[PDB]
Amino acid sequence: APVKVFGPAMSTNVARVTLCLEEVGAEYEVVNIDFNTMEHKSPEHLARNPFGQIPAFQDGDLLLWESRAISKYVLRKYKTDEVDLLRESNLEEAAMVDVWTEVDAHTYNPALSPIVSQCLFNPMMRGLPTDEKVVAESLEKLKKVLEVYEARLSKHSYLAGDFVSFADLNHFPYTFYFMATPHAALFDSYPHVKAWWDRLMARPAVKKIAATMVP
Amino acid sequence: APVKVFGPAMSTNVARVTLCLEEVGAEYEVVNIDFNTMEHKSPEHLARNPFGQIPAFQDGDLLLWESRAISKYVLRKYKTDEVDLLRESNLEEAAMVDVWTEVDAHTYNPALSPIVSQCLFNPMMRGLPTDEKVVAESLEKLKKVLEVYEARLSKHSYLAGDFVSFADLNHFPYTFYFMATPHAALFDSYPHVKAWWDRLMARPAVKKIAATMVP
Ligand SMILES: N[C@@H](CCC(=O)N[C@@H](CS)C(=O)NCC(=O)O)C(=O)O
Ligand SMILES: N[C@@H](CCC(=O)N[C@@H](CS)C(=O)NCC(=O)O)C(=O)O
């Protein structure tokens, strides 16, 4: 059997999961879920995710939610010697995958996402005005985060060490949409961070998932 | 050598780390960091965490930050057959540790923390007024989250299955402080969730870390 990813393909936390499936060479199917008719809150979907949110995943009789959990089960399940992206076979490396995965979720995303969810995902999706207050602020916040990212990505090819990893792939979905805003040119001031970004956009798995993220 | 946890012991993300050390039987030391004199932003501390936040950890020459990453490196490092709390030896079990760990960070904590950080951690720590708006709202939000927790903890002794796990321990630190507010009696309406809470408070490792969380 293939395994099943439930949500719209456009969606960032879907793309986390789909990218991980592409990277690892997995048979998979994407089942839409129609926000506009509350399918995410429908009882079918609540049996996948009791909290009524996308994505959900099913591998036969196993039902998972929370894109990061899904992603890790996919990364351990289809692991090869050729494609170890969580590095659990090395403790110290596995730690620096955890750190930078956690940095994305707790530092970077909370400073980047609100600019995406204001320039792009507010008028084009929800038809809601853009808050210059929240934007100017997360933009200042993100310049300082990219200061730390620059330092790191000047010492290492990737966030976790000198190997692509789950830490890096996590950063792709929301950054992809960042790069569709006027603010994308921000990375031009962070040339190490930029080179690392251009590296990720060069991978056959990313080129593919990128193709799935349009209106 | 022992390993080193940097921040105040009172702090929730310190306690995540310290609890995990106690559970697993590890030699460790807690090095205070004095918020009041900006030690968390001092250059010594920035060499641990470049983002200037607690906790940080050092195991000899390894420097980690982000309590969840720290916690997992501690849980893999000191793992016994007697104390497997991430269950990486079982995929399906490891997935349901990831899910409920992610639920804490993305559903539960964001609905609980703002009541803690308003009734307790605002006037007693920052000397800041309590926002009835934000409280009433996260309280309604949390009642519905505890609906899902009740369902689950009526089917299973613990969040991940019929075994204590990293998912459960994650929920301890902020819930501990929840239980010091007027709102603690909320759990009385969620008797399964309550029994699971009383179970966690009964473990020798939790009784110990609880002792460290006072003014
Ligand atoms: N932490 C989750 C994020 C889930 C999420 O962002 N949920 C959104 C996706 S657009 C949603 O379905 N929100 C609708 C709602 O809960 O009302 C993950 O890692 O997948
Ligand atoms: N996601 C982090 C949370 C870190 C955190 O909450 N930082 C606080 C701890 S009280 C802090 O030091 N804030 C000060 C600042 O960054 O200005 C973890 O898992 O440890």
Author numbering:
A (entry chain AAA), B (entry chain AAA): 2 to 216
Paper's wording?
In black-grass, upregulation of a phi (F)-class GST1 (AmGSTF1) has been shown to be a functional biomarker of MHR. Each protomer has two distinct domains; the N-terminal domain adopts the typical thioredoxin-fold, with the C-terminal domain being a bundle of at least five helices as demonstrated by the crystal structures of AmGSTF1 presented here.
In spite of extensive crystallisation and soaking efforts, no crystal with any substrate bound or any alternative crystal packing forms of the wild-type protein were obtained. Based on a careful analysis of the crystal packing, the key hydrophobic contact stabilising a crystallographic dimer interface shown in Fig. 1b was identified and three protein variants were designed to facilitate alternative packing. The Phe122Tyr variant therefore adopted the closed conformation for the two loops over the binding cleft with glutathione bound in the G-site. Having identified new crystallisation conditions for the Phe122Thr variant, a similar approach was used in screening for the Tyr118Ser AmGSTF1 variant, with the structure determined to a resolution of 2.6 Å. Density was observed again associated with a glutathione molecule in the binding site, although this was refined with a reduced occupancy of 0.7.
